[PDB]
Amino acid sequence: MISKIDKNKVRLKRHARVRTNLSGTAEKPRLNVYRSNKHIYAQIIDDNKGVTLAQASSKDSDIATTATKVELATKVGEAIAKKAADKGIKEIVFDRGGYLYHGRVKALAEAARESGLEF
Amino acid sequence: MLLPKRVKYRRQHRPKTTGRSKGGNYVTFGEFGLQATTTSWITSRQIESARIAMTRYMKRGGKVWIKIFPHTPYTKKPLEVRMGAGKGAVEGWIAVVKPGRILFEVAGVSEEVAREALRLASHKLPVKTKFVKREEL
Amino acid sequence: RVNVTLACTECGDRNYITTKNKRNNPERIEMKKYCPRLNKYTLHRET
Amino acid sequence: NRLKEKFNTEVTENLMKKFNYSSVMEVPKIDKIVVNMGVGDAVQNSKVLDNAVEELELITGQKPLVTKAKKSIATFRLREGMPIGAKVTLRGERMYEFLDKLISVSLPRVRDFQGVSKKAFDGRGNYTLGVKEQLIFPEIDYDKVSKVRGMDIVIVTTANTDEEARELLANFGMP
Amino acid sequence: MKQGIHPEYHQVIFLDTTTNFKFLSGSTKTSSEMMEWEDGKEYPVIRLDISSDSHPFYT
Amino acid sequence: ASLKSIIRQGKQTRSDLKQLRKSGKVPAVVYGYGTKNVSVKVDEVEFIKVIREVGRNGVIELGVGSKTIKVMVADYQFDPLKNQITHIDFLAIN
Amino acid sequence: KKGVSSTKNGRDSESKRLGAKRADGQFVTGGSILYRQRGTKIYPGENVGRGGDDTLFAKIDGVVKFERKGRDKKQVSVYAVA
RNA sequence: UAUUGGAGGUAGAGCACUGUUUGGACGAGGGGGGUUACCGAAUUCAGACAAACUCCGAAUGCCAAUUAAUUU
RNA sequence: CUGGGGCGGUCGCCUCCUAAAAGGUAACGGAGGCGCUCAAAGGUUCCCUCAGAAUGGUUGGAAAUCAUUCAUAGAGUGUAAA
RNA sequence: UCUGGUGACUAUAGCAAGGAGGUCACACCUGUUCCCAUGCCGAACACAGAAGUUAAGCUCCUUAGCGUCGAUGGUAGUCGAACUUACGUUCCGCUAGAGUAGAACGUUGCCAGGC
């Protein structure tokens, strides 16, 4: 008898191990992503002041739809890119959390890349 | 009965003898105790003499507790040598006692017999002593 | 363990000095290194 | 997919009522089974490793990973990192089918008075049991074998303690 | 599974004469003696067993 | 079981404390529920009489300033050489 | 002078002048060593680097500040304002 | 000198680690496959010991300061 | 060099204690190491988590491997020590 | 204050226990044809999906059994000074460790959906 565990804590442990180098300033904010079973969020975070500059999600009404959850990641990439471009942020640093770099997270970063975010 | 004795280092700096006893200042196992009122080294051989004196005066009666142990080794240079050329070999084992340290505890015997046994032990000992009872109140 | 001079295969120059174990590596070791004469990374061999 | 259907049709029915569960999730679902052979005297030889590969390569459908010795054990020549021991885990429909075959082939060659055994337990609900390669490989005969070994089997279940393991063994097992 | 290393298994039909306990499986990819459908169209490699005939507890 | 005490004032030096102790009085503090921390002094002989009267555990009536506090001896410091109480802790219950 | 009795241990190595090299509150220039050590008794903080010999040095000009990290760890930072 | 900040493990204490220790509980391994005394430890209770032990930890010395007073 | 010389020992570098909570600090004071090793035991990227204890078992010198819960890091860190 | 992100505080933050909670989805779950996938499992990783469940994880409420925090008062030690050769004494500052009463079953910035 073994215990199945929630995968968010192991993710968060890797996430702390990865945040030791990853930090967002105002000039270069950090693009975090949070991936769940159904949705993914993403934020533009300034760690030097501890504030969020922009935000996007697959729950968001302006983007919520019926897709394969990878196309949705593509949409969230574009939405966060547009919000950052409106606020005036060009260059960012990509925080992958601890969810590897693949599938939805890879598509999210790529969609942000085609839409202006220089990283 | 004893433990298998071995120390990490065999040649150690000699103990500080100035100050007051750190601990072991109360009778905690037995009913009566022999406490020190001056400070000296007790050399693992005065302990055996004192213990024989006490236990033999009680004729295998009450219990005896030795509250001090000879942890510290001391060295002595061989006879007729000049100063230097290293440190001498281990000569014996000591415990440093300071005023207030309980040296022996006795129980299971009358106050008179205990007082007499601890007097006899005190005479075998290089320290001034005092008879004390289990402190209460 | 022996000293080793790595000579540029292309330039020809003896640019780097290193060490190796003559039993673990009983051959002429090769590695890519910066030849400052040709301003590029070329193969160097233990020569 | 015999005991696969049998779980949701008889076990999730009867065990859910023999022991009360407020929701349907405390239905003790068998997760995986581990079949490590153990240790063979495989220090002057390196071929009975390949025999313990053929077994558990042929009986169950996966080649056993040869785990290496962790520490340098004394007396016998165990070098830290010297290969002794196999291991395979069945989880999916292979796990169900393996258990179904096991409960259909154990008793004939086991010759067990109980049918398998009564209890060999770590006090928590798993076997870590002993075999003498009798019940295994009915599929392939004994004529082509070389040694005699027995695996360290366990039962990984959502159950809690060996008390519940006895109840869950009712699936054509013999406690 | 402990996969990565795996040949071809199958849910074989151990349709023996003793209740036809063809709920079994194995790599016994032999000729289908009885290509039935209530059990798999595989070889009934299980030919003779007492598993369902003589149990020393319940014989 | 009606011991009395005297309110100590602030900043008693080492000399003051040892002059207090060389008499028959000991420093002590009182703390606990229903009151705040107050540092007082009690005569050693009367304390010993009260303790042999009511025992090691016994609700002692302690006279602090004008008010009597139902107090118990939580802890005390003893000097095995020249056997003598050196300080007492009184905790208030009520 | 004695005889055949001799000691087997009169050896030591040269002491390394480790420890703190700058003080809290004093302005330093970039590159100034702040703390020589073995291992990390003190971690680098803001605008402070850690050398190959675990030496902590300033990255920019400014005032040096030793701070706590968590429960039982220390760090040194440099802050730009002058 | 006053005021503030800092680095560090001494005196003292302490036994949380490394080791030395004295009594007492408790169950148990080789052993009188087991009993049973014990013996080697598992786990506890109360007491102690340390330059090369530290869960802790001063006084003072040390470094430096937007800074003040007095001096040279 | 030397608690007179001689005899014995030592002579350069590293770690610890002595060393008096900055640094430094001696004695023929107390303990040990070094005169290398590694083409991966270096760089970087991505993953991973230890020793031990029983609740224990085909071996079972006990403990090889294997199974489950505690395990503050007591393991490991090429090597002496910190 | 709600829920989910994220990050700032020395666990006063944690362990353990008892009890509630349900698509905002948080998780659970269904599978492997799809990238990927694991010296060695769709275990995990990755992917496609949303049919069953609050059971567990997670969130919330209680508790000091545990861990953590912790005075005042006193003591040890000690800067300085005055005596003195005692394993010392006295005065003046500083002032522990242990223990005690007690604190404590978290506070808080930004963002998004809720209200």
Side-chain angles (χ1 to χ4, degrees), chain A residues 1-59 61 64 66-70 72-77 79-88 90 92-117 119, chain B residues 1-59 61-62 64-78 81-134 137, chain C residues 1-9 11-47, chain D residues 3-12 14-16 19-35 37-75 77-78 81 83-109 114-171 173-175, chain E residues 1-8 10 16-18 26 32 37-40 44 50 52-56, chain F residues 1-60 62-71 73-74 76-81 84-93, chain G residues 1 3 6-52 54-82:
Chain A
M1 308 98 165
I2 65 170
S3 147
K4 65 187 288 189
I5 62 63
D6 73 338
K7 304 183 178 72
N8 186 35
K9 69 172 74 67
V10 184
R11 188 272 304 199
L12 260 187
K13 190 165 297 305
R14 310 229 202 69
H15 182 36
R17 279 216 199 172
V18 176
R19 271 293 321 280
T20 185
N21 331 92
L22 280 179
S23 315
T25 90
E27 287 42 62
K28 218 185 296 283
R30 161 184 60 122
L31 172 60
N32 191 1
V33 311
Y34 166 60
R35 160 187 91 150
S36 34
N37 285 159
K38 160 273 178 195
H39 74 60
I40 52 98
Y41 297 24
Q43 298 102 315
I44 290 323
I45 322 191
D46 173 306
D47 308 317
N48 278 193
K49 326 181 62 198
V51 315
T52 290
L53 251 54
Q55 161 278 345
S57 174
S58 102
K59 273 200 207 184
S61 54
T66 326
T68 73
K69 100 200 320 172
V70 181
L72 261 183
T74 308
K75 317 303 283 284
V76 201
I80 212 151
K82 214 54 50 183
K83 274 129 167 191
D86 298 348
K87 264 152 211 243
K90 267 134 73 53
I92 66 93
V93 170
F94 184 67
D95 187 327
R96 54 178 195 102
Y99 308 106
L100 222 41
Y101 180 79
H102 195 259
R104 309 199 247 156
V105 163
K106 180 162 168 58
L108 215 164
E110 264 139 26
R113 247 194 287 263
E114 276 73 309
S115 33
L117 256 47
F119 78 99
Chain B
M1 329 276 249
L2 271 274
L3 265 54
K5 196 154 165 33
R6 43 130 281 150
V7 284
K8 181 188 179 151
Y9 304 98
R10 221 160 166 83
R11 317 186 187 201
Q12 309 176 8
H13 293 169
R14 268 110 69 216
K16 177 173 271 192
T17 47
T18 281
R20 299 289 139 55
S21 183
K22 179 197 278 185
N25 286 6
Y26 303 92
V27 182
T28 62
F29 302 120
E31 337 187 7
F32 315 99
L34 183 82
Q35 98 166 9
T37 55
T38 42
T39 125
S40 158
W41 297 0
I42 314 295
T43 69
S44 148
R45 200 201 272 291
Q46 314 151 344
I47 328 183
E48 161 68 0
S49 184
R51 177 210 62 92
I52 282 166
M54 293 165 17
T55 76
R56 182 223 48 240
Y57 175 72
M58 300 166 179
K59 302 154 279 133
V64 182
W65 289 276
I66 309 179
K67 297 291 286 323
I68 58 166
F69 194 86
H71 292 299
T72 298
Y74 71 94
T75 64
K76 196 205 152 253
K77 280 280 216 176
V81 293
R82 283 192 222 239
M83 290 309 78
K87 184 145 164 86
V90 186
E91 190 47 25
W93 303 85
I94 72 192
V96 61
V97 308
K98 315 255 206 163
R101 167 76 62 151
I102 309 284
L103 310 174
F104 290 85
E105 263 162 67
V106 294
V109 79
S110 159
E111 180 172 0
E112 264 48 76
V113 173
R115 199 170 306 237
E116 187 57 27
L118 294 170
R119 188 192 70 90
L120 291 167
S122 180
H123 280 309
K124 310 296 215 270
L125 225 63
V127 74
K128 287 180 174 287
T129 57
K130 228 166 59 167
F131 180 86
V132 295
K133 274 134 19 163
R134 185 83 92 122
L137 188 141
Chain C
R1 292 225 135 230
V2 291
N3 299 96
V4 152
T5 310
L6 299 172
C8 169
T9 308
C11 1
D13 300 347
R14 283 148 153 183
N15 279 135
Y16 293 90
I17 270 279
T18 193
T19 318
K20 90 171 166 98
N21 191 309
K22 62 310 190 193
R23 172 177 316 320
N24 300 182
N25 285 73
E27 69 283 329
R28 311 228 312 205
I29 52 168
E30 286 134 76
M31 62 207 44
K32 285 189 65 66
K33 292 215 111 76
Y34 175 74
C35 196
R37 186 201 290 271
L38 311 165
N39 212 90
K40 101 177 145 182
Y41 268 67
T42 94
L43 193 55
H44 292 244
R45 179 175 340 247
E46 171 209 333
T47 308
Chain D
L3 255 71
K4 183 227 50 185
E5 269 322 330
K6 212 211 78 75
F7 198 58
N8 327 116
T9 53
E10 270 159 283
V11 198
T12 298
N14 77 340
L15 263 84
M16 206 267 192
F19 218 130
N20 74 61
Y21 307 122
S22 80
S23 194
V24 313
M25 275 327 329
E26 285 101 343
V27 288
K29 149 184 64 191
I30 192 161
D31 247 6
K32 61 165 182 291
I33 192 161
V34 66
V35 79
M37 303 273 249
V39 287
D41 169 281
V43 47
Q44 308 54 235
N45 85 65
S46 90
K47 293 78 56 191
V48 308
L49 252 46
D50 214 20
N51 291 346
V53 163
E54 162 216 9
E55 280 41 38
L56 299 191
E57 159 74 270
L58 212 65
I59 310 156
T60 204
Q62 282 95 23
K63 211 177 39 193
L65 59 123
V66 200
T67 300
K68 285 66 57 204
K70 321 220 71 58
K71 271 241 247 261
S72 205
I73 302 299
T75 312
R77 220 36 260 131
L78 263 325
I84 44 60
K87 168 216 175 231
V88 180
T89 54
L90 300 97
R91 275 196 187 258
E93 52 145 356
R94 200 161 262 83
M95 155 82 152
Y96 302 116
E97 94 198 348
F98 187 82
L99 245 195
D100 304 11
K101 180 280 193 159
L102 260 280
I103 51 160
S104 82
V105 304
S106 34
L107 175 152
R109 293 293 91 247
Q114 210 284 336
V116 284
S117 78
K118 287 176 182 65
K119 54 175 91 213
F121 264 7
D122 284 65
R124 207 180 296 275
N126 34 326
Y127 264 7
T128 47
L129 157 151
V131 193
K132 259 320 160 183
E133 67 168 82
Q134 295 175 356
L135 94 172
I136 46 183
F137 48 93
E139 145 190 20
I140 66 99
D141 62 56
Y142 220 117
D143 191 87
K144 33 218 208 172
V145 203
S146 80
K147 250 70 172 315
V148 45
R149 290 271 87 167
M151 309 70 82
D152 191 78
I153 296 101
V154 318
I155 315 80
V156 200
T157 45
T158 30
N160 275 45
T161 52
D162 43 3
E163 166 281 299
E164 202 107 5
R166 264 174 197 289
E167 297 178 359
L168 217 173
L169 185 57
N171 309 336
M174 317 75 97
Chain E
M1 281 136 233
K2 269 358 187 105
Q3 248 195 25
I5 38 190
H6 52 289
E8 179 249 318
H10 44 275
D16 86 320
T17 188
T18 324
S32 182
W37 285 151
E38 84 294 343
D39 301 341
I50 73 195
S52 181
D53 262 350
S54 68
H55 183 168
Chain F
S2 300
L3 179 65
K4 79 142 299 213
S5 68
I6 296 102
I7 189 86
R8 287 162 56 197
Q9 47 274 37
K11 169 45 74 214
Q12 282 141 330
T13 71
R14 191 124 47 179
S15 167
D16 294 343
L17 227 64
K18 85 190 37 193
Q19 274 184 21
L20 184 150
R21 256 199 207 90
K22 91 188 317 153
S23 304
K25 43 186 39 65
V26 317
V29 282
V30 303
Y31 50 85
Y33 153 66
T35 182
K36 72 183 77 171
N37 255 268
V38 154
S39 58
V40 293
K41 58 192 180 181
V42 304
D43 198 87
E44 178 169 31
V45 175
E46 334 199 4
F47 183 69
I48 288 156
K49 309 206 145 83
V50 173
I51 279 296
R52 50 177 56 140
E53 190 194 320
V54 75
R56 169 57 183 161
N57 297 110
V59 175
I60 291 159
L62 181 62
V64 182
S66 59
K67 47 223 199 183
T68 295
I69 303 169
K70 289 270 163 183
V71 92
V73 183
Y76 72 94
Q77 289 170 19
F78 194 61
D79 193 4
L81 314 148
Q84 145 185 300
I85 302 263
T86 39
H87 162 99
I88 305 168
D89 287 329
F90 290 127
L91 87 152
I93 327 163
Chain G
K1 85 223 163 174
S6 35
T7 178
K8 302 198 316 203
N9 48 253
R11 281 166 321 269
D12 196 15
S13 72
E14 192 84 61
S15 73
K16 269 70 181 173
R17 277 55 160 170
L18 317 165
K21 299 300 194 294
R22 284 309 209 252
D24 297 48
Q26 74 179 131
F27 172 58
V28 299
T29 50
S32 295
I33 295 193
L34 307 172
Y35 196 90
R36 279 218 208 246
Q37 58 177 311
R38 303 259 164 284
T40 33
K41 310 225 317 192
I42 309 196
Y43 285 78
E46 255 211 74
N47 310 112
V48 174
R50 175 192 171 185
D54 304 338
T55 297
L56 302 181
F57 61 94
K59 275 188 137 93
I60 43 83
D61 289 0
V63 175
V64 15
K65 211 79 48 176
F66 291 78
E67 305 137 18
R68 330 176 85 274
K69 279 174 38 94
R71 172 175 277 240
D72 56 73
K73 290 214 185 325
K74 307 181 196 234
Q75 59 163 239
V76 58
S77 319
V78 181
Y79 294 120
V81 166

